[PDB]
Design a protein around this ligand. Sequence first.
Ligand SMILES: [Mg+2]
Ligand SMILES: [Mg+2]
Lengths: 177, 169
Amino acid sequence: MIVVLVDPRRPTLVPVEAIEFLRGEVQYTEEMPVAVPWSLPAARSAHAGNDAPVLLSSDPNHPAVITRLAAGARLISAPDSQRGERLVDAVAMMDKLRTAGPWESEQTHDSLRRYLLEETYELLDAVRSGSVDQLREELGDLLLQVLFHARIAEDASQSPFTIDDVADTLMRKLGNR
Amino acid sequence: MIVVLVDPRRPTLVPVEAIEFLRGEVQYTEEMPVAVPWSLPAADAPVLLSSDPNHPAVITRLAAGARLISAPDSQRGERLVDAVAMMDKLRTAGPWESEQTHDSLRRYLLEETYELLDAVRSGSVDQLREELGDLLLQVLFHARIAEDASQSPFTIDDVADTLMRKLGN
Ligand SMILES: [Mg+2]
Ligand SMILES: [Mg+2]
């Protein structure tokens, strides 16, 4: 009857419109964090029992979600993700590979200064080649440099900063203009 | 009694741990969207709903022993989505930025990357962080220009996806 889709990057928060429908019998999909069944008193898994009048999930592709939606269940959904949230996914993967990476762990600002001027020229070649499918790839290569130098400046022993401070630096500079 | 503090960027989302408590009388602070009290069909109060940790009512009630049920803190990099939004506004409201193309931006790509190298071999952390934002701007600018493309547009999220697929291998 009702399908509740939450933000996958905040699967622990629910849309305010759904809380009355969340205190009864609900089913949660298997990718929901363990925090949800411990907060919802009378909830259970979507592979347990018969179908519940409301199913709580974060995966729009999950078969049960597609099932009940096709059968005319009403959807109560969290707002769509905002432009640039995969970027937050990106800095997390940069943080992960910085520690686990043998090479990536010992690299510093000077050991990266060599690569930067190369990747700029490859981006200039992409622009002049007119092909959209590698302007995008080299654009990623330049973003990788910005996230690497930023993750390194965290390990800074004097005046260390993060990717959130450079974003503040950029925004504060566009504001005086 | 209870303070429920929500993510200011995602103000209609409540922690699951607070569902039990938004049933009776509830108070909301001024910055909350008007839509939120309208969505709690079950409408001095024991429960205060807010998005502002520096609100006076939140501070006093927490200091008085109220229990806090808060949305998780922001992850490293959420300020990048603010930067994308500000890049989007200036692409549409700034006359000069509204005309820029991939070719016309080429000029300042080489200028700022050289300045970043100048900051690395200078030691200055305040200039390293500044020239990092200048280079970051170019990536957001080029990605935003791609969104307007008539042929095969992409966005900053797409280039973020492409970096990760390459990062996976
Ligand atoms: Mg390359
Ligand atoms: Mg500069």
